[PDB]
Design a protein around this motif. Sequence first.
Motif, PDB file in Angstrom:
ATOM      1  N   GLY A  90       0.826  -1.211   0.000  1.00  0.00           N
ATOM      2  CA  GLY A  90       0.000   0.000   0.000  1.00  0.00           C
ATOM      3  C   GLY A  90       0.851   1.247   0.000  1.00  0.00           C
ATOM      4  O   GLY A  90       2.056   1.168  -0.314  1.00  0.00           O
ATOM      5  N   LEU A  91       0.210   2.369   0.303  1.00  0.00           N
ATOM      6  CA  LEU A  91       0.819   3.701   0.120  1.00  0.00           C
ATOM      7  C   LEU A  91       1.780   3.937   1.271  1.00  0.00           C
ATOM      8  O   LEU A  91       2.730   4.710   1.100  1.00  0.00           O
ATOM      9  CB  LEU A  91      -0.276   4.760   0.094  1.00  0.00           C
ATOM     10  N   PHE A  92       1.537   3.250   2.383  1.00  0.00           N
ATOM     11  CA  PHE A  92       2.421   3.397   3.564  1.00  0.00           C
ATOM     12  C   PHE A  92       3.190   2.105   3.808  1.00  0.00           C
ATOM     13  O   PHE A  92       3.741   1.935   4.900  1.00  0.00           O
ATOM     14  CB  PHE A  92       1.605   3.755   4.800  1.00  0.00           C
ATOM     15  N   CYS A  93       3.199   1.217   2.820  1.00  0.00           N
ATOM     16  CA  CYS A  93       3.898  -0.080   2.939  1.00  0.00           C
ATOM     17  C   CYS A  93       5.278   0.072   3.594  1.00  0.00           C
ATOM     18  O   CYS A  93       6.131   0.870   3.119  1.00  0.00           O
ATOM     19  CB  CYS A  93       4.040  -0.721   1.574  1.00  0.00           C
ATOM     20  N   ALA A  94       5.491  -0.730   4.633  1.00  0.00           N
ATOM     21  CA  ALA A  94       6.767  -0.774   5.369  1.00  0.00           C
ATOM     22  C   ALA A  94       7.770  -1.556   4.523  1.00  0.00           C
ATOM     23  O   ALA A  94       8.977  -1.282   4.602  1.00  0.00           O
ATOM     24  CB  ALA A  94       6.533  -1.417   6.712  1.00  0.00           C
ATOM     25  N   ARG A  95       7.261  -2.493   3.725  1.00  0.00           N
ATOM     26  CA  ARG A  95       8.125  -3.321   2.848  1.00  0.00           C
ATOM     27  C   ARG A  95       8.817  -2.421   1.822  1.00  0.00           C
ATOM     28  O   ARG A  95       9.944  -2.761   1.394  1.00  0.00           O
ATOM     29  CB  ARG A  95       7.278  -4.409   2.184  1.00  0.00           C
ATOM     30  N   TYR A 104      14.585   0.460  14.049  1.00  0.00           N
ATOM     31  CA  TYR A 104      15.253  -0.867  14.160  1.00  0.00           C
ATOM     32  C   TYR A 104      14.254  -1.930  14.606  1.00  0.00           C
ATOM     33  O   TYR A 104      14.592  -2.761  15.455  1.00  0.00           O
ATOM     34  CB  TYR A 104      16.465  -0.801  15.094  1.00  0.00           C
ATOM     35  N   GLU A 105      13.070  -1.910  14.001  1.00  0.00           N
ATOM     36  CA  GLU A 105      12.024  -2.908  14.328  1.00  0.00           C
ATOM     37  C   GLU A 105      11.239  -3.233  13.057  1.00  0.00           C
ATOM     38  O   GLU A 105      10.749  -2.293  12.399  1.00  0.00           O
ATOM     39  CB  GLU A 105      11.106  -2.366  15.421  1.00  0.00           C
ATOM     40  N   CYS A 106      11.124  -4.519  12.729  1.00  0.00           N
ATOM     41  CA  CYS A 106      10.303  -4.963  11.575  1.00  0.00           C
ATOM     42  C   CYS A 106       8.820  -4.832  11.940  1.00  0.00           C
ATOM     43  O   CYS A 106       8.505  -4.561  13.105  1.00  0.00           O
ATOM     44  CB  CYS A 106      10.639  -6.366  11.065  1.00  0.00           C
ATOM     45  N   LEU A 107       7.939  -5.028  10.969  1.00  0.00           N
ATOM     46  CA  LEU A 107       6.481  -4.858  11.182  1.00  0.00           C
ATOM     47  C   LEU A 107       5.936  -5.979  12.078  1.00  0.00           C
ATOM     48  O   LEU A 107       5.255  -5.638  13.067  1.00  0.00           O
ATOM     49  CB  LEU A 107       5.790  -4.853   9.823  1.00  0.00           C
ATOM     50  N   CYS A 143       7.809 -10.782   7.051  1.00  0.00           N
ATOM     51  CA  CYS A 143       6.960  -9.619   6.663  1.00  0.00           C
ATOM     52  C   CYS A 143       7.614  -8.843   5.519  1.00  0.00           C
ATOM     53  O   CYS A 143       6.878  -8.200   4.755  1.00  0.00           O
ATOM     54  CB  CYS A 143       6.702  -8.669   7.825  1.00  0.00           C
ATOM     55  N   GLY A 144       8.946  -8.889   5.438  1.00  0.00           N
ATOM     56  CA  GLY A 144       9.742  -8.231   4.387  1.00  0.00           C
ATOM     57  C   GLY A 144      10.016  -6.781   4.726  1.00  0.00           C
ATOM     58  O   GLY A 144       9.883  -5.955   3.831  1.00  0.00           O
ATOM     59  N   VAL A 145      10.436  -6.494   5.960  1.00  0.00           N
ATOM     60  CA  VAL A 145      10.675  -5.107   6.451  1.00  0.00           C
ATOM     61  C   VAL A 145      12.100  -5.016   6.990  1.00  0.00           C
ATOM     62  O   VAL A 145      12.468  -5.851   7.848  1.00  0.00           O
ATOM     63  CB  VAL A 145       9.652  -4.697   7.522  1.00  0.00           C
TER      64      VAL A 145
END
Lengths: 1362, 49
Positions: A41-46, A54-57, A74-76
């Motif tokens: 999406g528009l705010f995708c963390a990926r 320093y934290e993944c989703l 998650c791919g972050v």
Amino acid sequence: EEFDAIKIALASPDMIRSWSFGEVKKPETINYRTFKPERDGLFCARIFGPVKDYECLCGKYKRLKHRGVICEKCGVEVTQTKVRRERMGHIELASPTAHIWFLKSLPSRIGLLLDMPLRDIERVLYFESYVVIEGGMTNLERQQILTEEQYLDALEEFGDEFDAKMGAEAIQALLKSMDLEQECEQLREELNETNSETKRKKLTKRIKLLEAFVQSGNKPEWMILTVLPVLPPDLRPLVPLDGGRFATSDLNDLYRRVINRNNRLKRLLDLAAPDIIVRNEKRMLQEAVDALLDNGRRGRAITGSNKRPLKSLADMIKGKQGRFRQNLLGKRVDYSGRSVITVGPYLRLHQCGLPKKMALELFKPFIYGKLELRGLATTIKAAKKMVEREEAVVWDILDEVIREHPVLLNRAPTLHRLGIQAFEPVLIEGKAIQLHPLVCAAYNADFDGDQMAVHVPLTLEAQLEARALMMSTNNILSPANGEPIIVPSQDVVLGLYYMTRDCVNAKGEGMVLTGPKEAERLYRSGLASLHARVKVRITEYEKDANGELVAKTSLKDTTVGRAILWMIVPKGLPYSIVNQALGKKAISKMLNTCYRILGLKPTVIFADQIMYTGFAYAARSGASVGIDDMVIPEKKHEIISEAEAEVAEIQEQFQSGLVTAGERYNKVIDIWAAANDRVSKAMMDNLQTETVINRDGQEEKQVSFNSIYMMADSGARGSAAQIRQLAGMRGLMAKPDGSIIETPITANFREGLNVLQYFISTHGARKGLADTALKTANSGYLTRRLVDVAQDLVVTEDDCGTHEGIMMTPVIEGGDVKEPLRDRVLGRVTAEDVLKPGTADILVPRNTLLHEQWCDLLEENSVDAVKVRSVVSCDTDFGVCAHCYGRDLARGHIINKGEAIGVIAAQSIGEPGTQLTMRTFHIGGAASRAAAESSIQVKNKGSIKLSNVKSVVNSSGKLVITSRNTELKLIDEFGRTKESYKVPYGAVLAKGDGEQVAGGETVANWDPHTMPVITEVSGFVRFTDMIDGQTITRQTDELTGLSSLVVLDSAERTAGGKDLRPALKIVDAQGNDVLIPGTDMPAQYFLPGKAIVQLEDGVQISSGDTLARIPQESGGTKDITGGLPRVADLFEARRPKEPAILAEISGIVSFGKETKGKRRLVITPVDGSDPYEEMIPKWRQLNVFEGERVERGDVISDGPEAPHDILRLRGVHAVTRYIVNEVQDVYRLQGVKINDKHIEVIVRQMLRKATIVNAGSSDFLEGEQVEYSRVKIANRELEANGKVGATYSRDLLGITKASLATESFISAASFQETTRVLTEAAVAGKRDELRGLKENVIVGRLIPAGTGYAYHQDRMRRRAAG
Amino acid sequence: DQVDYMDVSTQQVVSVGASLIPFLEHDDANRALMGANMQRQAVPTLRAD
DNA sequence: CACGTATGCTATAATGTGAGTCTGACGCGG
DNA sequence: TCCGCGTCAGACTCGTAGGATTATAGCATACGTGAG
Ligand SMILES: Nc1ccn([C@@H]2O[C@H](COP(=O)(O)OP(=O)(O)OP(=O)(O)O)[C@@H](O)[C@H]2O)c(=O)n1
Ligand SMILES: [Mg+2]
Ligand SMILES: [Zn+2]
């Protein structure tokens, strides 16, 4: 990071992909429940990065230990959240999309490139019609539009072997196929064969575009977008308000539009939808992208939630509000405070009262720091808690930090540099800032609630720049005029005035004291008054030839008061300074004198002393404002009833027939204007003196000590103009139009206006108030245009070693010398060894600063004309030399190299306008103009000198002038010019050329209302082309029947008479044409708009008679409202409707062709064989007659001159002097002193560019516009080496265009027109190396000027090696 | 004989705020404007006088 | 296996749209 | 050369207010991941 330059160029589809870290496929923002970013999406963390540091989703990796660890699940990426402000994404567009900025922005690049009109391209883009891309069969060529039906025809017949398409795919294909090289050659071949005047420009402009396109390495296809970049999330944030609600940028709504329609297009393509629906979706996709880039340009902007149009990308850059003007050319600032200001009369000039609590907060880090060095605070949080508790030891530490630490005070508006000043702060109990009185002038500070910004200079460097450069004490003189800005006012003036001013006898008249100490003791003892004549022995200290002071003791009659003031007066000054009754005007001179003799520290001490004594004696006196103060003249009612029956008689004569609305308006205004002066002068005689005081025996006359009179005469506050409205007559008030109301206010404020007089007053009042709100805007817009144009100008060199300069003569206009030559050349570098009359010994040297001493020598010898070195004629490339400029008027010595001169110039021209807007308007109600410009009366005896004059002798015996430009001068004995007097057209002279007149003689009378048309020849009068109703109008009277003719202009005129010029023609008794003495011209006088002729056709005229009266309505009021537009018109070089004609090339002239009456003046020079032929209007009458050897720029016509024509024929000093004088005319009318050198700076910036003819060894060819400095650089190396020589011609640019013509595009963008500037820079692949000030301020760097000039010149030499 | 009508009060030209200015007759219209404007900014004191 | 999220299908016939206006000024382009 | 088009218009201050507006159907199978 530290970089050299910035470049801008078109983005390739693949370039856009480089910045992207993924394709955003979905409109999904976040999850409604877990408010975290959705998949792709528009705010995708990926794509953009992790939400938290320093934290993944999905939360598998935490803490700073995990670094760049892309979570597999998650791919972050585990990095800082900061990345989400820097990482970009992209969008895969199904259909190619045109970039609005290159399509719609005029002129346009896609259109100019294809040589295809915008309309054609749009029909293609909205899928209305097909365009041909290429057909081997010339049947259909290139770029030929086909409608839906046109496409069906060729498709059956030819088809296949011809390619025509629709939408952005078509245009992209057309751009891809176009060969930049080949079209360049084809266009060059067209210009060689048949170069038509206007289309040579357009062809040369497309050539420049094609060349620049290939040199930039930009590809035309890229104007059409295949990949669309996505802005990083934090720059279009979705944040939770406290209320639990969310709030988001409109860019999110626009991105979601684009993604929805793009994805729907992918779908409809997968589904093989019918073409009408595919088309609609491609239209909607282009609409959404165009809304996202620049909303509102493509027609109706997309309104969001309220109805307000969504703010798009371009909108965040463009507007004043964009990012340039709001967040980059100025910002909100740390260690900043504000509060109400209030007086600090106890302060010294270098101090300011700073509230305790305010200063506590501003110097918080400085406290924390000393607290830890004393070991009173264990750490910072304990120091914070000690401050929070406001402990007693903290106050003592804060006192220690503020010591010797300067603070900047600022007041809005900051018009000129003294709107910021540095002070040493004084900690004070209370919440108000205390301001020193004497600087209130520079801030325009009055304490009825104004507020000031406080700023703390943090670094040692900033502290030093504040103490040395920006300190109050060190900024005494203004940047504009050499006059001081810091000076006592109000009480300080009232007190010193009360002390110095003398009264009759009083206590202890004609007493003898031994110095000022005895006088003071006497006054304090109460045996002597402050205003009593007393012989005293004061010992004055006069400077000798060296630095030693000589002492002189002498007895001089004086008051007690002035003797006591002598005690404050430093040794070096004469006692004559205090011996007059002192006002603010005299005290300013006193402090300037002291500054130039003794120096800075003595004047500082002396200024403080003056303030202390002034206020202390101000309270000792006891001046008050009673209602009896404003004494009305006994003889007001008489003057008024006289004036009132007079105006009444002219209104009755109005119904009779001798009067137009304009004539009577002028006559009534004249009557009341003279009445007002009469009643005012009656009040001021009755008030100023009319003091009957009995001297020691009998009665005497002396000056009145009436309170209001003292206030006015001292110059403390009200002027005679205000006191007219108090005690005299209020006068004629002026409407918001500027036209003056016919009924004046007879009453004054003491008398009480009545309901009608008060209501009539309102008009003028409110127009004044509206003027301050509205006009300060155009004033301020002019300041800003000026600043942008003259930002780069800096003192670069000490001496360019130039001889060149402009001849400055004394402004002697209107009898009394307006501005002396000494003052005009005070502080300039003298050019050309200019000695005394007898040429046999040099008097003055060459490169030497004109000091007050040199100037005083100049006056003994009475030099009239002096060539002085000017900014305009300076040879320095990329700045100006200290010598061409001269003295820094604010410093009182030679200008420092590195000083930003341009800025000071723009500020100093801009300030008065902006200040005079609000100032004269709230303060005055009525208009006190005086129009009685009838008769010249000469003040001193002498002989009449008439230069530029051609007059005819009338049957009266009198010399009636028929020249337009006429200058009557008053020569003395020795033969100097002392008085001037502009004689008009239609004037009767009392005496002719070179005749003696005595003191107080009238030498010429003329009517002010009506410019008559005066005939040279005598005979009968013929009506040419004067058809009634067509060109004129007829108006008849009673009993006998007197008809009068009014010349209707083309405004009221019918289509029938448009081409007819109406003119009174002179024929003789036979009815042949009478010739104008000595020429082949027949007499014929062309009547303009509303020329009211009385005397009907066939009337025998004598010569020198008035034929026609054109009415001259002067509805102008004397204000800056009307002056400033003239100032803006000169600075922007606005050509007039009727430009003045001037000799183009020297040589000998005869007449050739005529169009009915229109002259085709044919110049055929002597040496230069080519002729120059001009079409000229019929009615425009020539100064020149026929065969004369006239040089370049000899005046042919009557009318205003275009600065362009002046520069182009006469040259630099001519046009510079024209601007300087025409601008200064306006400002001088409002009593504003600005030095010419400031105006000269901005004219230099106007004459920046130059067009070139021919080629050199570089890429000039025909008519490229390049800057003057750069072509001179080329010419210097060319002349030494040889190569092809290049003819050049300087071009004038008026301010706005000159600022956009700068080769820094960061300055051009920040100024105005940002969208257009960035498209032209992006297409040229332009590279900005950051030379100007605005450029460096934007990137937040050291300015290349002042302090920064040292560091900046060190970087330029680091470019030579390492 | 020509007169048809007459102003009812001397006050009718002026608004409420300006009607509260005593010697309005002797005051410049600009200053009077700001006077009527500042009366609206007047905070009531502990003792209404 | 439960829970959350999504794509599915409904059968009388119906098949062509739809805000605010007015500043005054200036400089290019068709 | 005439007339639609489009780019212009001072600097800081504080005090603010409103979330308002809107309608959608109801239920079964399918698609997909998480808890016990
Ligand atoms: N809309 C305004 C009002 C005021 N000012 C600035 O603030 C100054 C002072 O305003 P004001 O106090 O109203 O005017 P004064 O001339 O001081 O008159 P007075 O206080 O006596 O009414 C103005 O001249 C001007 O520089 C401004 O820039 N914009
Ligand atoms: Mg004020
Ligand atoms: Zn994870």
